[PDB]
Amino acid sequence: MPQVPVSLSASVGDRVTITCQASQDIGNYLTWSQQKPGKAPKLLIYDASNLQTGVPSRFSGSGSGTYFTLTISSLQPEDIATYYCQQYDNVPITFGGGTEVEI
Amino acid sequence: MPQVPVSLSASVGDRVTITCQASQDIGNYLTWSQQKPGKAPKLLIYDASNLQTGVPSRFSGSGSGTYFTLTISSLQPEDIATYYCQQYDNVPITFGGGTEVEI
Amino acid sequence: QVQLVQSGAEVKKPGASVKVACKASGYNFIHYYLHWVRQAPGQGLEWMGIINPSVGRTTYAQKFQGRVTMTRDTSTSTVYMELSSLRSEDTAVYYCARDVGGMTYCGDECFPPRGWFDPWGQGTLVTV
Amino acid sequence: QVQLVQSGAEVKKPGASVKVACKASGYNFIHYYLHWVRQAPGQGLEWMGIINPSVGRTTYAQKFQGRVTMTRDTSTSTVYMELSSLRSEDTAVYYCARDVGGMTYCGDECFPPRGWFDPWGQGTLVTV
Amino acid sequence: PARPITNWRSGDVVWVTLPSAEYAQSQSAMGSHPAYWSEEATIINVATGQRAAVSSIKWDQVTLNGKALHKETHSGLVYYQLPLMGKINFWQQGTTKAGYTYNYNTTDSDSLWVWWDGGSKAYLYISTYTTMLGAGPVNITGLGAVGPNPV
Amino acid sequence: PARPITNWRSGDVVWVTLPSAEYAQSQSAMGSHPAYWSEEATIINVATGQRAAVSSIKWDQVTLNGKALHKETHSGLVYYQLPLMGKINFWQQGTTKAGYTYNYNTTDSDSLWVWWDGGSKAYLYISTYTTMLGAGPVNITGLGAVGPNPV
Numbered sequence: 001m002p003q004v005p006v007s008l009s010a011s012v013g014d015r016v017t018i019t020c021q022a023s024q025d026i027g028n029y030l031t032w033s034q035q036k037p038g039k040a041p042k043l044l045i046y047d048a049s050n051l052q053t054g055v056p057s058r059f060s061g062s063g064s065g066t067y068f069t070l071t072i073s074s075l076q077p078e079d080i081a082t083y084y085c086q087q088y089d090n091v092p093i094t095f096g097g098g099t100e101v102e103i
Numbered sequence: 104m105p106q107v108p109v110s111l112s113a114s115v116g117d118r119v120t121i122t123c124q125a126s127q128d129i130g131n132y133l134t135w136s137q138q139k140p141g142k143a144p145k146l147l148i149y150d151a152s153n154l155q156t157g158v159p160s161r162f163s164g165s166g167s168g169t170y171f172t173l174t175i176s177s178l179q180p181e182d183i184a185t186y187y188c189q190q191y192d193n194v195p196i197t198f199g200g201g202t203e204v205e206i
Numbered sequence: 207q208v209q210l211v212q213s214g215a216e217v218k219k220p221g222a223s224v225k226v227a228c229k230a231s232g233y234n235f236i237h238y239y240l241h242w243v244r245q246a247p248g249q250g251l252e253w254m255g256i257i258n259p260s261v262g263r264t265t266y267a268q269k270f271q272g273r274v275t276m277t278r279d280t281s282t283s284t285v286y287m288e289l290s291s292l293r294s295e296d297t298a299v300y301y302c303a304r305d306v307g308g309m310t311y312c313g314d315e316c317f318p319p320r321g322w323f324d325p326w327g328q329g330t331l332v333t334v
Numbered sequence: 335q336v337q338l339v340q341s342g343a344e345v346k347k348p349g350a351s352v353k354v355a356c357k358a359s360g361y362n363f364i365h366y367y368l369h370w371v372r373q374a375p376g377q378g379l380e381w382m383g384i385i386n387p388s389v390g391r392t393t394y395a396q397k398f399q400g401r402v403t404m405t406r407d408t409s410t411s412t413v414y415m416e417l418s419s420l421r422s423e424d425t426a427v428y429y430c431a432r433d434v435g436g437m438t439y440c441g442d443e444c445f446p447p448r449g450w451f452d453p454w455g456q457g458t459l460v461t462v
Numbered sequence: 463p464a465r466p467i468t469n470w471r472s473g474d475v476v477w478v479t480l481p482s483a484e485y486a487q488s489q490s491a492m493g494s495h496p497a498y499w500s501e502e503a504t505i506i507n508v509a510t511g512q513r514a515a516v517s518s519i520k521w522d523q524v525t526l527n528g529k530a531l532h533k534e535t536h537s538g539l540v541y542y543q544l545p546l547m548g549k550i551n552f553w554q555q556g557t558t559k560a561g562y563t564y565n566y567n568t569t570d571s572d573s574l575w576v577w578w579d580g581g582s583k584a585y586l587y588i589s590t591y592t593t594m595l596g597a598g599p600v601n602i603t604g605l606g607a608v609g610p611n612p613v
Numbered sequence: 614p615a616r617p618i619t620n621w622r623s624g625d626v627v628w629v630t631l632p633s634a635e636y637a638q639s640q641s642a643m644g645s646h647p648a649y650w651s652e653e654a655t656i657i658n659v660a661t662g663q664r665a666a667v668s669s670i671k672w673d674q675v676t677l678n679g680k681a682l683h684k685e686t687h688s689g690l691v692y693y694q695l696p697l698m699g700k701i702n703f704w705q706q707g708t709t710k711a712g713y714t715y716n717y718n719t720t721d722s723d724s725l726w727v728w729w730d731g732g733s734k735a736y737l738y739i740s741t742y743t744t745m746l747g748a749g750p751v752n753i754t755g756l757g758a759v760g761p762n763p764v
Contacts, residue, residue: 028528131679440473
């Protein structure tokens with residue numbers, strides 16, 4: 001599951017879009033997670049687009065089938081982390097590769 | 104639910120029989136519990152006769168409907184306690200009254 | 207591991223509210239009914255009421271009619287008991303015990319809820 | 335409260351067995367599947383296998399085929415991971431994550447088990 | 463709390479209750495066959511224990527296997543479908559008087575149907591053949607297992 | 614673990630599996646009507662998650678609502694009964710091909726039946742009308758709710 005943007009830096013308050021590509025159809029069995037340097041990865045959205053409770057409304061998912069995307073409306077400083085796309089369709093779970101977001 | 108024996112003392116190694124009488128038909132919805140002076144009551148048998156896992160095989164229940172009884176084959180010193188019969192048939196749970204057993 | 211832990215012992219003056227909690231761990235809190243049983247130091251066991259930890263329904267005893275309220279907290283898996291008038295005769299060890307058999311999803315189809323008392327709480331002594 | 339706690343970090347010599355546990359509390363242990371994911375300090379996340387805490391079935395990865403065994407303990411609500419050959423490249427943070435959606439009683443009828451990762455473990459670092 | 467009651471997956475077990483149920487001679491959502499309905503129904507997830515009043519669910523937000531439910535509009539009324547693997551088993555509350563569905567002699571599996579007005583009023587419909595439990599009002603209880611999305 | 618899988622109560626939900634099920638033209642335990650049976654069946658308690666192989670259960674120790682099960686002897690074979698509130702819902706494993714019971718047009722509630730030889734061999738029987746899912750062997754999955762004891 002290649003992640004087309006590997007490292008994107010944008011001004012504070014800009015919009016960020018991160019895309020994931022699959023090798024076969026998954027549907028909505030994909031999730032977006034955020035990982036800080038020392039921590040366990042925190043879950044942003046359940047499925048292709050389903051916001052977790054507590055995550056602020058900047059994060060929102062999209063996409064279906066094979067092409068998935070993650071969009072963020074504002075680029076608050078708490079967004080310096082890595083984001084991952086991981087499918088849960090087939091038995092071998094695989095991850096994206098990660099994007100480093102800077103300001 | 105009167106308990107006919109209120110206090111019975113028997114020699115170590117004797118057989119102990121404790122009877123409970125109900126005001127109405129209960130079926131097998133009765134349990135026997137053992138309580139030490141300072142403790143929560145410990146459970147001997149689930150139903151009219153169904154031994155708890157871990158309780159020695161001395162303790163054995165019997166009876167059905169209205170007349171219930173508790174039997175003890177040997178009277179090891181660990182038996183100095185109080186025993187209670189409590190129904191779980193109708194909405195107000197009621198207890199027996201207790202028997203103080205001595206050696 | 208299935209276990210119920212109760213709050214510490216308290217002493218109250220004649221006329222006061224005592225709130226006793228019973229935390230739950232090791233299973234599904236909302237699946238099992240819970241009870242409260244009082245234990246005077248000399249007398250025997252006195253059942254006080256039952257609670258549904260899924261909808262919050264209660265069923266109190268005739269003696270403890272206008273004085274007892276029971277509540278639950280799903281988030282922290284705790285059930286609460288409150289005694290209001292609190293005369294000197296309300297000096298007892300209060301117990302929380304998990305009920306089995308009927309598991310709160312049948313509804314009224316299994317609410318003569320039949321089941322022996324799976325783990326009793328450690329006990330909490332209140333002195334008035 | 336749903337939570338998974340892992341054992342402390344460890345350091346091992348090249349060639350050894352490391353056993354990492356993940357205690358479970360706040361829910362039904364036997365109802366949910368669990369996974370194990372490694373995290374090399376520079377590289378990304380590597381899923382290693384899945385476990386059914388009800389029957390004990392496993393499904394490992396091709397890379398960790400002859401080196402990884404996973405076990406469970408129903409009594410203590412814990413799942414275990416073992417790495418055998420343990421070369422220097424096995425320096426990673428190992429994670430336990432609870433799987434949702436398919437809940438071990440359907441069987442094969444829901445075992446492409448679909449569900450995101452509900453709480454990840456705190457992580458355990460092993461250095462070879 | 464791991465998966466919301468709104469989220470559904472194949473293999474979920476659902477315990478429905480249809481209090482003071484009425485009898486509808488023809489139900490459009492099931493191709494004009496009789497159904498039982500209650501306006502105060504409750505959906506219970508047996509394995510996880512979560513429950514919700516049917517009238518309290520925003521049904522356009524309900525998903526099954528990651529996708530939105532299959533909905534049909536019949537004469538201006540919106541009906542949401544929750545497919546099940548197998549037939550829906552229901553019986554009169556408190557009795558052993560069991561009912562049967564319209565496809566009693568058929569391989570076709572049953573599916574729950576919900577009407578929702580977009581606000582706080584909703585019904586729950588189950589396939590039936592006749593007044594085998596009466597004309598209503600009567601309390602009934604249904605049990606079923608959630609199945610894959612329609613193709 | 615609160616109540617053993619051997620202890621049954623009214624309202625329990627049971628998820629049965631009958632791998633490699635065969636078809637019996639007449640079953641004595643249900644009054645000479647067809648049934649599906651598997652010798653490697655497994656019983657799942659959906660709400661509590663416990664499970665047990667049918668062949669691994671000593672069925673003379675199984676109780677329902679505090680009392681032993683109802684058993685019938687037919688031509689030297691002992692059959693144990695687990696009554697259900699409603700009909701038993703079963704379907705072919707992995708497919709939406711559902712089956713139906715013998716009393717498809719009847720109020721009578723269905724009931725699981727088990728044969729046991731006293732050792733480590735046991736079958737599980739479900740009421741059926743015909744070979745609606747085939748003559749066997751075929752994997753099937755059943756779902757039902759435990760009901761009160763027979764009178």
